[PDB]
Design a protein around this ligand. Sequence first.
Ligand SMILES: Nc1ncnc2c1ncn2[C@@H]1O[C@H](COP(=O)(O)OP(=O)(O)O)[C@@H](O)[C@H]1O
Ligand SMILES: Nc1ncnc2c1ncn2[C@@H]1O[C@H](COP(=O)(O)OP(=O)(O)O)[C@@H](O)[C@H]1O
Ligand SMILES: Cc1cn([C@H]2C[C@H](O)[C@@H](COP(=O)(O)OP(=O)(O)O)O2)c(=O)[nH]c1=O
Ligand SMILES: Cc1cn([C@H]2C[C@H](O)[C@@H](COP(=O)(O)OP(=O)(O)O)O2)c(=O)[nH]c1=O
Ligand SMILES: [Mg+2]
Ligand SMILES: [Mg+2]
Ligand SMILES: [Mg+2]
Lengths: 205, 205
Amino acid sequence: RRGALIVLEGVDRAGKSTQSRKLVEALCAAGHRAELLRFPERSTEIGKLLSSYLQKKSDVEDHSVHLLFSANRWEQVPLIKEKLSQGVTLVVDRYAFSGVAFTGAKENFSLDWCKQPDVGLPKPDLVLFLQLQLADAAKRGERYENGAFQERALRCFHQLMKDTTLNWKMVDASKSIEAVHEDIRVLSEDAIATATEKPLGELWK
Amino acid sequence: RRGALIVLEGVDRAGKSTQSRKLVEALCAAGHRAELLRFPERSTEIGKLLSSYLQKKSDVEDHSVHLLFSANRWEQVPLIKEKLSQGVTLVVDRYAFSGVAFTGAKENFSLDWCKQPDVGLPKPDLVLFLQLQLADAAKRGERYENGAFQERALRCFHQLMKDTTLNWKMVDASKSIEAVHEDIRVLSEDAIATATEKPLGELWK
Ligand SMILES: Nc1ncnc2c1ncn2[C@@H]1O[C@H](COP(=O)(O)OP(=O)(O)O)[C@@H](O)[C@H]1O
Ligand SMILES: Nc1ncnc2c1ncn2[C@@H]1O[C@H](COP(=O)(O)OP(=O)(O)O)[C@@H](O)[C@H]1O
Ligand SMILES: Cc1cn([C@H]2C[C@H](O)[C@@H](COP(=O)(O)OP(=O)(O)O)O2)c(=O)[nH]c1=O
Ligand SMILES: Cc1cn([C@H]2C[C@H](O)[C@@H](COP(=O)(O)OP(=O)(O)O)O2)c(=O)[nH]c1=O
Ligand SMILES: [Mg+2]
Ligand SMILES: [Mg+2]
Ligand SMILES: [Mg+2]
């Protein structure tokens, strides 16, 4: 039986990294083979250019930066497919959705253009959206770290959620770390148990 | 008056670099402000990864490599737009067409997916296609340097030429360097003189 591809999305400070780490821990403690992945994955050459960019150490033309973020996902596709075929469930901290939402929050970027590079990536079996008021997210904890930009990103995320081809689940990320974790864990157990019967799909196609 | 954006395309060994160099020389000698550009532009960080890839010094997942080639064009867009607005005609040795044709020659790559990343780039005013039999190209002068792959690339180029939104001009590249140059020079003079009256367009949109 293949593993499940579970993605956590949300604006900055929504609790994605905290919940992805806790989810992998709990699934492993309950006997599942599960591993954490994140995007961008900064250990690669592409990821290094992305990190310099996000730290404002370098400036990059907006379309180039968008394409590098997508290429950074494609470079991990062979690994993603191999792990899933091996029975390993992958918990992914940000994915193509963040890619479209953050670039789509910029001027003169259509959602259609932003989606294309990621068309065909492994399709998540479950996309958890950690919902919380922007003002709350701002009380917790770089480029894109301002309220007006987060608000436009959030709107883009809501457009992507109209996409019925995907198993979106809303999570109330305003609760305690432990309460949000239990909600996420129960949804993830269900997806691992029931969403893996069908072959891995292809995103946005 | 803005400069013209002229692109030279063709399979490997078609004479693109020789003709692009000669064209810029002749236009400048005839009083035009013209400069040469090429893709990939290996002087950048992205271009360096592309060069390692083409030299087989590194392996790269096919979708990532496709997106890096496109990002390498977008990183030069601000410069392209500035030069053209300044009256400078740009002669470009390979462009988005090569990008689509070479990736589209690989298995499981649709032309549509291959075009998307380059949608919206500056639209060439003239696209010269240096036509010559593959067997001839092979008598002149790396990754992709085998006949079966060049033949699939060539077929992709012929699909792109169905695109009526673009000013494609076929050149008989089997003639002498000087004869091919004169054909190219005359077409280029016409485009500089007549194709620049309208604003710079956007590719594939
Ligand atoms: N449910 C929560 N309640 C309060 N603070 C939280 C909660 N989840 C995470 N945090 C804190 O908010 C900050 C951002 O969390 P993090 O998981 O890194 O978010 P993200 O990856 O979405 O930016 C961290 O300091 C974290 O401890
Ligand atoms: N018209 C031509 N006839 C014969 N050889 C040519 C002609 N044009 C170019 N060549 C030679 O073919 C080789 C490849 O030319 P080049 O301009 O670098 O092609 P490309 O950039 O399309 O690969 C070079 O050695 C060049 O001198
Ligand atoms: C995956 C992904 C993220 N992003 C954004 C979301 C974040 O704001 C940012 C990286 O923020 P940064 O603060 O540098 O890192 P981290 O959140 O790990 O501490 O990248 C994109 O713009 N495109 C993408 O494809
Ligand atoms: C511009 C571009 C070229 N190409 C290919 C065409 C050439 O085969 C190759 C670079 O070949 P290489 O032999 O490394 O360089 P050059 O032709 O300058 O000596 O890149 C792509 O695959 N995608 C692209 O977007
Ligand atoms: Mg995080
Ligand atoms: Mg489309
Ligand atoms: Mg050349």
